[PDB]
Structures are given as structure tokens and as C-alpha cells.
From a paper:
We combined the truncations on both proteins to yield a minimal construct, Mm SYCP21325-1479:SYCP3105-248, which we term SYCP2CC:SYCP3CC hereon. We found that Mm SYCP3CC also forms homotetramers in the absence of SYCP2CC (not shown), and when we determined the structure of Mm SYCP3CC by x-ray crystallography, we observed an antiparallel coiled-coil homotetramer similar in structure to H. sapiens SYCP3. As SYCP2 and SYCP3 share limited sequence homology in their coiled-coil region, we reasoned that SYCP3 homotetramers may form through promiscuous coiled-coil interactions in the absence of SYCP2. To compare the stability of Mm SYCP3CC homotetramers with Mm SYCP2CC:SYCP3CC heterotetramers, we measured their melting temperatures (Tm) using a dye-binding assay. We found that the SYCP2CC:SYCP3CC heterotetramer is more stable than SYCP3CC on its own (56.0°C Tm versus 52.5°C), supporting the idea that the heterotetrameric complex is the preferred state when both proteins are present. While the SYCP3CC homotetramer is likely not the favored state in the presence of SYCP2, its structure may nonetheless be informative as to the structure of SYCP2CC:SYCP3CC. Overall, these data show that the SYCP2CC:SYCP3CC complex forms an extended coiled-coil tetramer with an overall structure similar to that of the SYCP3 homotetramer. Using sequence alignments and the structures of H. sapiens and M. musculus SYCP3, we generated physical models for SYCP2:SYCP3 where the monomers are arranged either parallel or antiparallel, and mapped all identified crosslinks onto these models. In agreement with our SAXS data, the crosslinking data strongly support a heterotetramer model with two SYCP2 monomers arranged parallel to one another and antiparallel to two SYCP3 monomers.
A highly-conserved meiosis-specific structure, the chromosome axis, assembles in early meiotic prophase and provides a scaffold for the organization of chromosomes as a linear array of loops, and also orchestrates the formation of DSBs and their repair as inter-homolog crossovers. Mammals possess two such proteins, SYCP2 (1500 residues in Mus musculus) and SYCP3 (254 residues), which are both required for proper axis formation and wild-type levels of crossovers, and are known to interact with one another through their C-terminal coiled-coil domains. Mammalian SYCP3 is known to form coiled-coil homotetramers that self-associate into larger structures both in cell culture and in vitro, but how SYCP3 cooperates with SYCP2 to mediate chromosome localization and axis assembly is not known. We further show that both SYCP2/SYCP3 and ASY3/ASY4 form heterotetrameric coiled-coil complexes that self-assemble into extended filaments, paralleling our findings with Red1.
Numbering used by the authors:
A (entry chain D): 115 to 211, 218 to 237
B (entry chain C): 105 to 211, 219 to 234
C (entry chain B): 111 to 215, 221 to 238
D (entry chain A): 108 to 238
The structure:
Amino acid sequence: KASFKASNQKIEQIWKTQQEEIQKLNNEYSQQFMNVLQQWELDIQKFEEQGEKLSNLFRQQQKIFQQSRIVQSQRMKAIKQIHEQFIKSLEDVEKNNTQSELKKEMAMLQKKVMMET
Amino acid sequence: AKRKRIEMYTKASFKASNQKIEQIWKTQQEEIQKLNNEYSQQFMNVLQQWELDIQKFEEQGEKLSNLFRQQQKIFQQSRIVQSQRMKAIKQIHEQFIKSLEDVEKNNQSELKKEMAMLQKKVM
Amino acid sequence: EMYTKASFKASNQKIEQIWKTQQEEIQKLNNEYSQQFMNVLQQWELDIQKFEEQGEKLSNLFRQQQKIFQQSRIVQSQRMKAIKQIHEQFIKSLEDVEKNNDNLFELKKEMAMLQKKVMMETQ
Amino acid sequence: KRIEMYTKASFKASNQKIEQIWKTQQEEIQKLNNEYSQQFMNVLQQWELDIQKFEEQGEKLSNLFRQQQKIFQQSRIVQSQRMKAIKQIHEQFIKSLEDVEKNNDNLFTGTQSELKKEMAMLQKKVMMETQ
């Protein structure tokens, strides 16, 4: 059956060369596909790390917010004191005060006047 | 009696002009207190409003922190799904490729089986 | 002779269908992969553009925060100007009172008249 | 004659002692208000610095955000650049495959035609080997 076997191989050749074509096309695709898919995962990473940076820039601006608050609150309190003391310390000045030291200078002047009469 | 009249008169004269001089001072020092009273109130009323300012600043910022908690939690999920689709297609592709790979490995046994039927039928 | 042409043609029919089947088995694979692929890609596209919307959302939360800061600064500035002025007007108005008080030391009038009284009442 | 001289000069000295009393008191008050003015103004100068330090920080943080926002937007350009890139590759894949199929279907030079030919070529060979 040599005639049958010779034409049996000539058919499979027809087949497999055809199928070889389709496979070379799939290899080329895959290779190309996976290459670009790989660098795409890299860029996808940076794009999330840039999502990070912005989201950190806000939390930073949040901290500023509270620091200013505290600062504001510390300044107002320092002023209030300074003022409360000033007021206290004038109240002590009023207690230190003279209208009798006036009576004394007046009394003396009275003595002086009586004498010379 | 004459002398004792004049003693009394000057003592009187001095008392009265004591009260005068002391009222003079009293009136000024009270003018002064009015200025300082008016001052510290004005003063206090601005410290009062600086404190309202600070609280309305707090509340406005407390509300941003909550809004940012929201947008961040969504943005984080949005970020997780993008890596998930990433895993999904790499898999769809790798599968499609093994299937075509396995298809080739399986590929032919019916061709020879037909030739053998045919040859047997030609015999 | 005539039979073998008949079996030959039947054999060619089975071969043809064998080839056509597998060919159609490949292209079902190619079509189901390329349909999946497209479905995800379109999806992932939307889920990419959704990240931007969340990102543009944050730069608006950012500019809002910045806007809050400009107003607290302006107000703080305006408050400090109010207070510096109240204090300045205070100080000034003490200076003003101190001038009117060089009139008071009035005491010299009291002391004159007292003298005159005492003088006349012993001379 | 000497009496009248004694009462004048006694009143004057008594008068400048009264005035001096009032004077000292007023200087004492003045010194307080001075100090308080200093302490006050000191806290105003700090508060003024605090304002401008807050502003400088937030002005810097906003530029960092400007820059990082551009850097972000370029990264979306990159993303959709990979989209098109991948879409093309797959599309050209499918084109390549339909071309391969169209060529494998040519009635004259397809793969069935090459099959039939060799089949007929076997048949002709088998029937002359009998005759």
C-alpha cells in the first residue's frame, strides 16, 4: 500500500503547514500582547503612586489646618492674659492710692497759717 | 470769743477746700476709668469674635475631612478594580493561548482512520 | 472500479468535514476570546476614567481647603487690625485726657481763693 | 507786711507739693500702660508672623499639588495610549486571521482543493494499477 502511504503524508503536510501558519500568527500576537501588557502594569503602578502623592498633599494640608487652629488659640489666650493682668495691675494701683497725703499737706499748711497769726 | 471764731473759720475754710480739691481729682480719675472700661469691652468683644471665627473654621475643616474620607475610600476601591481587570485579561489571554496549544497537541487520528477504511475498502 | 469511485467520494466527504469541523472549532475559540477581551477592555476603560473623576474630585477638595485658608487669613488679618486700632485709639485718648488735665494741676484757683479768704479774715 | 509774705510763700510750696503728689501718681499709671502696650504689641508681631508662616506653607503645598496634578494627567494620557496600543494589536490579530481564512478558502488554491487534488491523484493511481 505504498501509494496510500505516500499520499497519506502529502495530506498531513497540507494540513500542518496550514495549521503552522495560524500558530505563528498566535505566537506573534501573544508575544506582542504580553510585552505591552507588562509595561502597562508598570505604568498602572505609577498612576496609583501618583494617586498617593495627591492624597498625601491633602492630609498635609489638613495638618496645617489644625496647627493654625492651635496657633490661633494660643495667641488669643496669651493676649487675654496680658490684658487681664494690665487690668489687675491698675486695680492694685487704685488700692495704692495720696488723697490723705493731700490732707496731710493741707493740715500742715493750716498749722503754718495759725502760727503766723 | 473773737479769736475762737477765727480759729473755726479757717478750719472751716480748709475743710471746704479740701473737699473741692478732692472732688477735682475724683472727677478726673472717674473720667479715666470710663476710658479704660470702654477699652476692655471693645477689646473683649473682638477676642470674642476671633473665637467664633476659629470654631467656624474648625467646623468647615472637620466637614472637609469627612468628605475626603469618602472620596478617598471610593478612589481606593476604584484603584483596586483597575488592578483586578488587569489580572482578568492577562488570564483570559493566557487561557485562550493554552487552549489553542492543547488543540494542537490533540490534533489527524481520524484522517489515518479514514485512509485505513478507504484502503481496506479498496482491497 | 465503480464501487471504488463511490467509496472514494464518501471518503473525501468525511475528510472535508473533518477539516471543516476543527477549522470551525478554532474560530469559535478565536471569537469567544475576542469577545471577552473587548468586553473587559470597554469596562476597564470606564473604570480608568472613573479614577480621574475621583482625582479631579480631590483637586476640588484641595482648592476648597485652600479657599478655607484664604478666608481665615483675611479675617484673622481683619481682626488684628480691629484690635491694634482699638488699642491705638485708647492710648491716643489717654494722651488727650492728659492735656485737659494740665488745666486741673483749677487747684490753683481753689488755693488762691482759700488764701484770700484766710488773709482777709486776719487783716 | 511780713505776715502776708509768709502766707503767700507757704501756700505756693504747699501747692507744688500737692501737684507733685498728683504728678507722681500719674507717672506711675503711665509706666504701667507703657509696659502693657509693649507686651500687647509683642503678641501682635508674633501673630503677624504666624499668619505669614501659615500662608507660606500653604503656598508651597499648593504648588506641590499643581505639579503633582500635571504629572497625574500625563499618566492618564499614558494609560489610554496603552489602550489604543492593545486594541490595535488584537485588531490586527483578527485581521491577520480572516486573511488566513480567506486564503484557505480559495476554490482554486484553497486547502480543500489541495486535498481533493491529492485524493483524485491517489484514485487515478489506484485505477491504473488495477488495469
